[PDB]
Amino acid sequence: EVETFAFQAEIAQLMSLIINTFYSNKEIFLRELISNSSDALDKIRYESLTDPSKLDSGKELHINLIPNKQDRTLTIVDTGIGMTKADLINNLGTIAKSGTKAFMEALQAGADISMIGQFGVGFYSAYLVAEKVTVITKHNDDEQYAWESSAGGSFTVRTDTGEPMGRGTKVILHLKEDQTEYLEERRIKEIVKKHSQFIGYPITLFVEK
Ligand SMILES: c1cnc(-c2cn[nH]c2)cn1
């Protein structure tokens, strides 16, 4: 049972701009997704300070980077607070309408795409390198759901029957054919060292057989 939704016009405009603008510094997508994971881990940590049972779904707070050259996917896994179904539909827990508005005024006033995270819509930088993005998420107050979009103005939401997560979010980047450098160990290591050196959670880069 798959539900198909239309993006708000402003968000469709944001994704088309990310996809169509010539902009070589694509590597910032990873910084933005790791920063979102860190924000999500901060949220569940804060809730656990007054209610330890919030971590019954998983005590470990971490970020895993899982490249898969056979599937041509880069997966970013975190054990943060996760998102409800309502969060997923409402632009993955962002204020993307007003964030896009501010972002696009900044771009016409000197800014470049690498500053997207300052406007709260850094998730959509995934489409710098991915032709399709799948988001699997589990919030303590909801069931496990799968969000998916290949842009084109629509996204889908369905209950996820796959591997249970416990709690957190898994962003699966189905990479573009010419963006497979982000599956190489030394390239991922370089980007993490360059842009995410002060993230306060363990970031584990998985290796492949
Ligand atoms: C990218 C975008 N959003 C997230 C997230 C996780 N929990 N809540 C929001 C993670 N990575």
Curated annotation (Swiss-Prot):
Q: How is it modified after translation?
A: ISGylated.
Q: Per the record, which residues fall in region Interaction with NR3C1?
A: 1-209
Binding annotation for ATP: 36, 78, 97, 123
Top-level taxon = Eukaryota
Q: Which cellular compartments is it found in?
A: Nucleus; Cytoplasm; Melanosome; Cell membrane
Q: What is the effect of changing residue 78 to A?
A: Impaired ATP-binding. Strong interaction with HIF1A, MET, KEAP1 and RHOBTB2. Loss of interaction with HSF1 and ERBB2. Los of interaction with TSC1
Explain what the record says happens when changing residue 32 to A.
Strong ATP-binding. Strong interaction with HSF1, HIF1A, ERBB2, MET, KEAP1 and RHOBTB2. No effect on interaction with TSC1
Q: Which residues carry this modification: N6-acetyllysine?
A: 43, 69
The record's note on quaternary structure and interaction partners says:
Homodimer. Identified in NR3C1/GCR steroid receptor-chaperone complexes formed at least by NR3C1, HSP90AA1 and a variety of proteins containing TPR repeats such as FKBP4, FKBP5, PPID, PPP5C or STIP1. Forms a complex containing HSP90AA1, TSC1 and TSC2; TSC1 is required to recruit TCS2 to the complex. The closed form interacts (via the middle domain and TPR repeat-binding motif) with co-chaperone TSC1 (via C-terminus). Interacts with TOM34. Interacts with TERT; the interaction, together with PTGES3, is required for correct assembly and stabilization of the TERT holoenzyme complex.
Q: What is known of its domains?
A: The TPR repeat-binding motif mediates interaction with TPR repeat-containing proteins like the co-chaperone STUB1.
Q: Any idea what job this protein has? A: Molecular chaperone that promotes the maturation, structural maintenance and proper regulation of specific target proteins involved for instance in cell cycle control and signal transduction. Undergoes a functional cycle that is linked to its ATPase activity which is essential for its chaperone activity. This cycle probably induces conformational changes in the client proteins, thereby causing their activation. Interacts dynamically with various co-chaperones that modulate its substrate recognition, ATPase cycle and chaperone function. (Microbial infection) Seems to interfere with N.meningitidis NadA-mediated invasion of human cells. Decreasing HSP90 levels increases adhesion and entry of E.coli expressing NadA into human Chang cells; increasing its levels leads to decreased adhesion and invasion.
Question: In which family does this protein belong, per the annotation?
Answer: Belongs to the heat shock protein 90 family.
Name the chain's protein: Heat shock protein HSP 90-alpha
